[PDB]
Amino acid sequence: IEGGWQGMVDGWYGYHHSNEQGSGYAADKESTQKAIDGVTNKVNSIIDKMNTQFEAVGREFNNLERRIENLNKKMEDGFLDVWTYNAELLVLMENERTLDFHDSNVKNLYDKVRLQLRDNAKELGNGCFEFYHRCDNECMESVRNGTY
């Protein structure tokens, strides 16, 4: 695929059909539903795992408690560095998975149309499929519906 389509503001994934009748976009709701759930599950799971995070507390020491004052300082900075690391590292890794996750769902959706019409259509290579028969608007919905 070259790039995305601005002409589809209906959903995240979909189809563009060209027809003797007309031509226009259509979002795949079953595939979009699965992605909104998988993303909303992820973002919430990141928040819930991090709510056990370290909470610092002010502690006061006198001028002959310098060693424990330093120890206290090291310990609290230590934990905040760890958890800062965990927060950042998880976000970077989650973003990688999330971008590759959207990719996977484009490959899998392309294969489904390739599989749903195997011998009745030729794959072009740019993310399309040419019918070897005439497919009207009910037929085209059937390809979008899943029953074919």
Contact residues for a second copy (CB under 8 A)? 45, 49, 52-55, 57, 59-61, 67-68, 70-72, 74-75, 78-79, 81-86, 88-90, 92, 114-116, 118, 123-126
Quick one: which of 108, 131, 147, 95 has its CA closest to 18?
A: 131
Q: Which does 33 bind (CB under 5 to 8 A by kind): a second copy, another protein, none?
A: none
Whether 16 and 6 have beta carbons less than 8 Å apart is answered as no
Beta-bridged to residue 25, according to DSSP, are: 16
Residues 77-96, mask of contacts with another protein (x by CB under 8 A): ---xx-xx--xx--xxxxxx
Helix (H) or strand (E) holding 81, with range, is helix 66-116
Q: Does 61 bind another protein (CB under 8 A)?
A: yes
* Whole-number Å distance between alpha carbons of 87 and 85: 5
Residue 72 interacting partner from a second copy, another protein, none (CB closer than 5 to 8 Å by kind): a second copy
